Paper text:
Cyanophycin is a bacterial biopolymer used for storage of fixed nitrogen. First, cyanophycinase breaks down the backbone peptide bonds, releasing β-Asp-Arg dipeptides. Then, these dipeptides are broken down into free Asp and Arg by enzymes with isoaspartyl dipeptidase activity. Two bacterial enzymes are known to have significant β-aspartyl dipeptidase activity: isoaspartyl dipeptidase (IadA), a bacterial zinc metallopeptidase; and isoaspartyl aminopeptidase (IaaA, also called plant-type asparaginase, EcAIII and IadC), a common Ntn-family enzyme with known plant and animal homologs.
RhIaaA has 51% sequence identity with E. coli IaaA (EcIaaA44). Like EcIaaA and other Ntn-family enzymes, the pro-enzyme is expressed as a single chain that undergoes autocatalytic cleavage into two subunits, a and b, which constitute the mature a2b2 heterotetrameric enzyme. We assayed the activity of RhIaaA towards the same set of β-Asp dipeptides used to assess LmIadA and found that it could hydrolyze all of them with no apparent preference towards β-Asp-Arg/Lys. To confirm the structural basis for the lack of substrate specificity, we solved the structure of the wildtype enzyme at 2.7 Å resolution and compared it to that of EcIaaA. The crystal structure of RhIaaA shows the expected heterotetrameric architecture. The enzyme displays high structural similarity to EcIaaA (0.58 Å RMSD across 230 Cα pairs, PDB code 2ZAL44), with the active site residues being almost identical in both sequence and conformation. In EcIaaA, the Asp portion of the substrate is bound by T197, R207, D210, S211, T230 and G231, as well as the catalytic T17944. These residues are all present and in the same conformations in RhIaaA (T183, R193, D196, S197, T216 and G217, and the catalytic T165). As is the case with IadA, the substrate likely binds oriented in a way that positions the non-Asp portion of it facing a large opening in the active site. This presumably results in minimal interaction between IaaA and the substrate residue bound to Asp by the scissile isopeptide bond, which would enable the active site to accommodate a wide range of β-aspartyl dipeptides.
Numbering used by the authors:
A (entry chain D): 180 to 313
B (entry chain C): 7 to 162
C (entry chain A): 6 to 164
D (entry chain B): 180 to 315
The structure:
């Protein structure tokens, strides 16, 4: 699974996700990537999210929507919500994976609960990083 | 503006990661950031940014989307993709497809050409053709490492 | 004690167009569905068995847009979606774009119970139906004249 | 679209949904029914939900999950949450439809914002009702 989240010059958000799925998956299996509120999500009032990991766990917990809900209903920060869901909720259901997300103010979080996550970000400053592990 | 990307949490284990592969991986991620950065830098939309970034990740054979997509039990590709715009929660998605060079561009074609937020099978491919998106054979998508990953996985 | 709730869709006929015969027929169908689910719970069956049997009954009733009496696509075919979910562990199974299985909800359940997946589509989904030994029906079984006329009228009113 | 939600004697919940989709639908279109957290949902800690209506609106708002979230995060009742989402949120984005739901204590709610919703319930008492419009 691969994905991207962006915050525009006007503070407008968008998310996109694409995947080949899971190696030796049963033909016809659909994961979280194409299900808005599970693996892909964007609302300019909260955050944009693109997830990667056990697709079934992400579908069952509605991970992307849960983070949007925690921001709206408990007034949590994107970081607090995203960290809680990937760190605790996803662990509790026995799922592995992570998540890139950008809030409406441009805060980027890239939590994961597994060995690593191919990831990167670039700012309007030109400032850039890419990562695999730490 | 800001852009974040990922190429999956299905990372190669540290003990199998060489300095060349590590460098190759960071290079691929760098090219993706540039694709999305070019859009935002040019004053383009968040939607254009994530579309172009994900199209780049699809094009990179190191990452499990478009080219370098993992194989199913029956040695074929089934690719899922979605876009969503936070302004109006407008969205488009596809699942179980193979042929479109850039599934994410089909996901976007669904959002822009239909009133639907998820489409499957031949209906989804019909929108790709309407949108004039590029189709590719299984050869284009094929990467030896994913094929070997399947053959090793099937040892079970 | 146990309880069951059901629906046969929000796409109801407007009250001013609803006849006393159709109203009675509709309440009869809903009554048969409640009995199907009640029998399960009454017999000490699971909440999963209850909603499966109830939804299988709603599929079987031609007044309701699921299984038999399923609406038609633009191209005059049926594409049927279904899901089950158990609240104990949020275990789930679902299918989309299916046609042939007599009771799509029984396929949705077969997915949950036979695979590690919570959603399956196309021929992969039908393969699970066959494995699970679920009943298949011809296109005629699902066909109802009213739905067919609904399509033809709907297509006509797009010209 | 059709569906059912149940609570057993021990308070265990389940939900199921099935649909033939939408008249003159585009081949390939998938609505809320088969997507857990949208049209179908069950958690023994909150409620079981089966939805019917404009699938896209239910997918965009994640209606079933939103109701589970409002119960868990704000301590709302199933009625308060379900009625708010169907009555207000679904209306606001211009979507039509409704929802049957049963909470973990057996409270049943069947909100809809449209002409009617073919529905009923039966209790362990034997007590039963069916409805189409607002009355029984
Ligand atoms: Na790729
Ligand atoms: Na039926």
């Amino acid at each position: 699974t691969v994905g991207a989240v962006a915050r525009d010059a006007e503070g407008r958000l968008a998310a996109a996700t694409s995947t080949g799925g899971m190696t030796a998956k049963r033909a016809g299996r659909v994961g979280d990537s194409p299900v808005i509120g599970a693996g892909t999500f964007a609302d300019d009032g909260t955050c944009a999210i693109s997830a990667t990991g056990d697709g079934e766990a992400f579908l069952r917990l509605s991970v992307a929507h849960e983070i949007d809900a925690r921001m709206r209903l408990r007034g949590e920060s994107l970081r607090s919500a995203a960290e809680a869901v990937i760190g605790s909720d996803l662990e509790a259901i026995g799922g592995s994976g992570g998540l890139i997300a950008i809030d409406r103010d441009g805060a980027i979080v890239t939590p994961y609960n597994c060995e690593g996550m191919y990831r990167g970000w670039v700012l309007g400053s030109g400032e850039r990083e890419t990562a695999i592990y730490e | 503006y800001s852009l974040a990307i990922h190429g999956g949490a299905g990372v190669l284990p540290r003990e199998r990661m060489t300095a060349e592969r590590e460098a190759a991986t960071h290079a691929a991620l760098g090219r993706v950031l540039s694709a999305g950065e070019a859009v935002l830098s040019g004053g383009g939309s968040a939607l254009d940014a994530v579309t172009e970034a994900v199209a780049a990740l699809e094009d990179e054979p190191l990452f499990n989307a478009g080219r370098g997509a993992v194989f199913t039990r029956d040695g074929k590709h089934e690719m899922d993709a979605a876009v969503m715009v936070g302004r109006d929660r407008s969205a488009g998605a596809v699942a179980g497809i193979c042929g479109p060079r850039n599934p994410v561009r089909l996901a976007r074609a669904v959002m822009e050409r239909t009133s639907h937020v998820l489409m499957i099978g031949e209906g989804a491919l019909g929108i790709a053709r309407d949108a004039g998106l590029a189709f590719e054979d299984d050869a284009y998508f094929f990467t030896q490492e994913r094929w070997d990953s399947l053959q090793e996985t099937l040892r079970m």
